Structures are given as structure tokens and as C-alpha cells.
């Protein structure tokens, strides 16, 4: 995000999709994701226990840490 | 183990604006 001069509510589009629902898929919606996203492939080493919590929203996705964040994935 | 959840998640689409830093976010290492 070089040169930063605004304020975008897309990232929601992001929590969106988990807010919509309940909560309780917050930090394990992404968590399961870390799931593949460690998988080497183009990261060999990592730290899938740690990048797992470590990990966040984006952040941006929300904006919630009261909610809780994980690392995701996409199609 | 919700099933629902995991499956909510894919079952859905996983979401791409995040594809982003959920991929991104494997970087943390400079050289």
C-alpha cells in the first residue's frame, strides 16, 4: 500500500462474507485456510502453527480485533 | 470441529479480496 492517501470500505466485502454469518467462523474461517496457503508449493518452510495465529484479517477485512483474525485463503 | 464452518468456507468461495494477504502475507523474510 505505497503512498497511502485513502480510506476504502471494501476490505468489509472480506469480513462480509464471515460477519454476515456468525462470528463463531471468525479466526477459524482463516485458520483452516492458513491450511492451504502453508502448504509449500510456493512457500516451502513455514509456520503454519504460528503464521496460523499470527496471521490477521489483513488486516482490513473488518476491523475488529474483539472479533478475532486468522489468515485466509481464495479460490 | 464445526462442519459447517469449515464447510461455509469453502462451501461459499473463498473470499479473494483477501487472497491478498491471506497470500501475501506468506512473505517475512528479507534478504
Known amino acids: 500500500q505505497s503512498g ?3 480510506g476504502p470500505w471494501l476490505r468489509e466485502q472480506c469480513c ?3 460477519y454476515q ?3 463463531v467462523c471468525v479466526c477459524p474461517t482463516l ?8 502448504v509449500q508449493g510456493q512457500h516451502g518452510p513455514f509456520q503454519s502453527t504460528r503464521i496460523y495465529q499470527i496471521a490477521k ?11 478475532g483474525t486468522c489468515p485466509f485463503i481464495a479460490i | ?13 473463498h473470499l479473494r479480496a483477501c487472497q491478498q494477504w491471506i497470500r501475501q502475507q506468506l512473505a517475512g523474510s528479507p534478504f
Request: hydrophobic fraction near 20%; glycine fraction near 0%.
Open chain 1, 31 to 38: 485458520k483452516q485456510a492458513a491450511k492451504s496457503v502453508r
Open chain 1, 57 to 67: 484479517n489483513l488486516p482490513n477485512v473488518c476491523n475488529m480485533k474483539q472479533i
Open chain 2, 1 to 13: 470441529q464445526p462442519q459447517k464452518c469449515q464447510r461455509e468456507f469453502q462451501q461459499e468461495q
Open chain 1, 4 to 6: 497511502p492517501q485513502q
Open chain 1, 21 to 23: 454469518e456468525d462470528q
Open chain 1, 16 to 18: 462480509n462474507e464471515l
